[PDB]
Ligand binder design. Structure first.
Ligand SMILES: [Ca+2]
Lengths: 78, 79
């Protein structure tokens, strides 16, 4: 078993490497440990998750920008 | 400026490197030359363009897959 702090560290690593499938699995592993945490640690993990979500939402808007440039190229190839 | 052969080569280089802004620019430069080309070079270019469309469409689909997994991660984060 990995401890909460060790999964927390892999979660941020996954996010940085833009490895979202691995992130998914870590969050699902973390889901088991969530119910037996003290309230202060839980609240800091949830606060941290807001910041994590800000990171991937910026990555998502960048993917949409790159998709759109390919749409321009596609029109220009046609 | 550059001739058609050099542009076509840089175009394939831009596709490989995911440099779609440079592709756009190169395609604009090519569109000026298109009118003057022989019918044989035009058809060569149209054929290449098909394969090129396949490559960037495959890459656009890959990006959407990333977006789709990202949406799942958000859900799992938003509990
Ligand atoms: Ca992975």
């Amino acid at each position: 078993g990995m401890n909460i702090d060790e999964i927390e560290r892999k979660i941020d690593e996954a996010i940085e490497k833009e490895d979202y499938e691995t992130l998914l699995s870590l969050l699902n592993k973390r889901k088991e440990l969530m119910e037996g945490l003290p309230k202060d640690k839980l609240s800091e993990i949830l606060e941290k998750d807001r910041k994590r979500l800000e990171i991937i939402e910026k990555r998502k808007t960048a993917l949409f920008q790159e998709i759109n440039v390919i749409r321009e190229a596609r029109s220009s190839l046609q």
